[PDB]
Design a protein around this nucleic acid. Structure first.
Length: 166
DNA sequence: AGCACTGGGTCG
DNA sequence: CGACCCAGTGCT
């Protein structure tokens, strides 16, 4: 991992991003697969999307990564990031371990730090926190029609803002 | 049980 | 019709 690529993806979370995280067990709201929807341009932040869809007629190009859910102390070696190429151009980051946990809601900030070629750490930056205030401006790029914002920050400065050594 | 799939929505 | 948004179904 080149020094230039040791960065953190900051993205403002929406409703669909946290619908299953906030939902109660057995609710329709808490049904389905839990993702964070990212920008399609962020694929260069991830390993080569080479893993193909087994079933299905439409093409999906996926990659498996080690995601370190920091807020729940869990490293999922099977965190799938998928580009729905022939469907709706969704770029999804699997976050199923946060289901029914309620650690994130709308306008919270997801911080995805790249610490290796295939190694990542996921932190939820709750709204109302100084960290959220200092991280929010780094999300300059507007995506979606619901006002999602994303951007990148050096692991250094992010580490300073949240008080963590990388 | 829970995620790989499905397939609409909406805005420009 | 490109690019996120959203709510599931059904297969493993």
């Amino acid at each position: 991992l080149d020094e230039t690529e040791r960065v953190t993806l900051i993205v403002t979370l929406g409703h669909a991003d946290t619908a299953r995280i906030q939902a109660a067990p057995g609710t329709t709201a808490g049904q389905g697969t839990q993702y964070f929807w990212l920008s399609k341009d962020s694929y260069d932040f991830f390993p080569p999307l080479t893993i193909r869809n087994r079933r299905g007629t439409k093409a999906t190009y996926s990659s498996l990564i080690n995601m370190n859910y920091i807020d729940i102390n869990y490293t999922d070696t099977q965190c799938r990031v998928t580009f729905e190429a022939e469907n709706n151009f969704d770029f999804r980051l699997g976050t199923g371990k946060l289901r029914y946990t309620g650690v994130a809601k709308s306008n919270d900030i997801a911080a995805i730090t790249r610490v290796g070629d295939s190694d990542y750490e996921l932190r939820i930056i709750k709204q109302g926190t100084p960290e959220h205030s200092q991280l929010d401006p780094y999300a300059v790029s507007f995506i979606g029609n619901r006002g999602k914002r994303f951007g990148y920050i050096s692991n250094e400065e992010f580490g300073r803002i949240i008080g963590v050594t990388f």
